[PDB]
Every structure is written in C-alpha cells, then in structure tokens.
Write a protein that binds this ligand. Sequence first.
Ligand code: MTA
Ligand code: ADN
Ligand code: ARG
Ligand code: SO3
Ligand code: SO3
Ligand code: CL
Ligand code: CL
Ligand code: CL
Ligand code: ZN
Ligand code: ZN
Ligand code: ZN
Ligand code: ZN
Ligand code: ZN
Ligand code: ZN
Ligand code: ZN
Length: 269
Amino acid sequence: KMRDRLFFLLSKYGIRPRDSIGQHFLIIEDVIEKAIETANVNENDVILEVGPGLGFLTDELAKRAKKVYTIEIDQKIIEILKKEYSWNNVKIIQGDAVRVEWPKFNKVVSNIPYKISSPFTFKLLKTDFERAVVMYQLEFALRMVAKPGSRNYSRLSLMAQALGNVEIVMKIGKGAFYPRPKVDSALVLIEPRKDKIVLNENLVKALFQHRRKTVPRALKDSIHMLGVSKDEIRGIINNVPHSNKRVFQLYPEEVKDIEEYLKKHGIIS
Ligand SMILES: CSC[C@H]1O[C@@H](n2cnc3c(N)ncnc32)[C@H](O)[C@@H]1O
Ligand SMILES: Nc1ncnc2c1ncn2[C@@H]1O[C@H](CO)[C@@H](O)[C@H]1O
Ligand SMILES: NC(=[NH2+])NCCC[C@H](N)C(=O)O
Ligand SMILES: O=S([O-])[O-]
Ligand SMILES: O=S([O-])[O-]
Ligand SMILES: [Cl-]
Ligand SMILES: [Cl-]
Ligand SMILES: [Cl-]
Ligand SMILES: [Zn+2]
Ligand SMILES: [Zn+2]
Ligand SMILES: [Zn+2]
Ligand SMILES: [Zn+2]
Ligand SMILES: [Zn+2]
Ligand SMILES: [Zn+2]
Ligand SMILES: [Zn+2]
C-alpha cells in the first residue's frame, strides 16, 4: 500500500531518484510504525527529521507531535512535499543537514542518508536531546553499538556510548527501500544517560589515532614537553590508570579516569 503510494507519486511528479544524494525511499509501513513507537512520540514533542523524501515518516510524525522540523537537500522534493501535504505543524528546511543550523528539538526520529552517517551523528552528540530513533546503514549501526574490545570499537562507538544507551531495535533489509540500495539498515535507539560522561575531544582523538596501542604507548606518542620534562612524563605514564589496556578496550568511564589523571598532573590545562 505504501509501496503503491510511492509508485503513484513518482509518476505523478516525474521524480527521478538521484543516487548522488542516495535517494532510497522507505516503503515498509511496519518500519515507520516501529520507529514512531520506539520514539514514544507525544503531543508535546518537537521532532527533528532528516531527508523526508516522499514524506511517509514525516506524515506519521506530524499527526502525533507538537512540531516537526524536516531538512531536505533536494529542492524538487520540497516542492512536492508542499503540494502533496497540508500539515499545520511541519517546517521544511532546505539544505544539507550536515551544514545547516539545527532548530531546537527534544527528539530525532529519522532515516539517516547513508553518506552523512558519521557527520550527522557527531553533530547530534553535541546536542541536547531526550531521545533519538534513527535508521542507519547496518554497518554503521553495528559500529555505534560495538562494545569495548570488539574489532569495530572506534571513537564513534566511545563518544556515542559516553552520551547514551545505544542499541539496535531492528534490522531493516534493503528490500525495504525503493530504489533498492546495496546495503541493509538498522533502527537505532539512543537514550541519553542520566550519568553523561563528558570526554575531552583532544584526549580521545590522540588515544584513538592508533587504537590498537597500549594506553602508555599512545600517551607516550601524544605528550609533549610543554611545562613537563622527559622524566616527569615518564613518571606520569608509569602511573597512568588502565595501563594494562589497549585503547580499543576502554569504556568511557576508563577514558574519563585517564583524563582526570592527566588533568591533576597538569597535562590538560
Ligand atoms: C530517503 S533517501 C534520503 C532523503 O534525504 C535526502 N537527503 C540526502 N542527503 C541529504 C542531506 N545531506 N541532507 C538532507 N537531506 C538529504 C534525499 O534527497 C532524500 O529525500
Ligand atoms: N604537555 C602538554 N600540555 C598540554 N597539552 C598537551 C601536552 N602534551 C600533549 N598535549 C595535547 O593533549 C593531547 C592529548 O594528550 C595531545 O595530542 C596534545 O595535543
Ligand atoms: N632521563 C634523565 N633526564 N635522567 C637524568 C636524571 C633524572 C632524575 N633521576 C629524575 O628522575 O628526575
Ligand atoms: O530527485 S529530486 O530532484 O526530485
Ligand atoms: O584496566 S583498568 O580498568 O583498570
Ligand atoms: Cl546510496
Ligand atoms: Cl494523514
Ligand atoms: Cl614527542
Ligand atoms: Zn503494489
Ligand atoms: Zn544508492
Ligand atoms: Zn508494537
Ligand atoms: Zn497527511
Ligand atoms: Zn562499508
Ligand atoms: Zn595503528
Ligand atoms: Zn613533542
């Protein structure tokens, strides 16, 4: 049925899906219903959506939320949304979601275009939001929920899990989109922690530059003789918390220990 509505609109408006901007439209209603339901959308919520496409998720959000902001890069798609729908409570913003200024919202409920997965997510993690329910390329989702010590645990994994509980709610087959992409998707829930861990970006980048290294080794390669001599640096590294771990095995809390330790010895400010 939603599939039927897609084919109706494609020929009604002469839409040519563009792969330059990864145009793959969700056509499985169960996936939209699961997103909405996970998001627990209520009449007080202000929702951010990226890449509304033909508006199938947008429409479900508009009927339940106080307001939806939706960011769309394709001007033609915007014109179609304006003609096809009549919402009283949706503001369409034109631009690349990675570049434009975001409005204030408390929840994101969105398909995420494959090509902006990383910059969208890092931008999101620097925002105040109560809940995020976002569809990612499966491989990127797996990266986001990867555990410390796993092969794909990376800076993204750490920063996202530092901010929130991150989990995969469902896998979404490629057959769920028209045109059919070459990758699967996953629905990801991000539940911001009461106990938010806020980590120094510079420490994290330095550590994760070579994340297979032991913590002492990565610190040895990052610490300069800036208000601290060679022997002082050797003393500092000798007593670093979590000296027995490699970087890729660190929880957010353990990075925080290293950060607080470096702060007390003068190395960060
Ligand atoms: C549903 S496929 C992605 C949808 O988001 C749009 N889109 C793709 N890339 C971006 C982006 N960087 N910012 C906003 N919308 C985007 C596409 O035009 C399509 O409607
Ligand atoms: N002695 C230092 N004082 C201040 N910042 C430093 C010092 N040594 C390294 N840093 C910065 O902190 C990062 C994490 O250790 C390093 O890559 C570097 O940018
Ligand atoms: N590695 C050196 N610079 N050695 C010279 C003596 C350093 C001195 N024993 C110290 O620990 O402060
Ligand atoms: O694909 S957009 O140009 O409607
Ligand atoms: O290796 S750390 O947890 O002590
Ligand atoms: Cl694509
Ligand atoms: Cl409706
Ligand atoms: Cl050095
Ligand atoms: Zn059909
Ligand atoms: Zn594609
Ligand atoms: Zn249900
Ligand atoms: Zn409607
Ligand atoms: Zn890949
Ligand atoms: Zn390396
Ligand atoms: Zn140096």
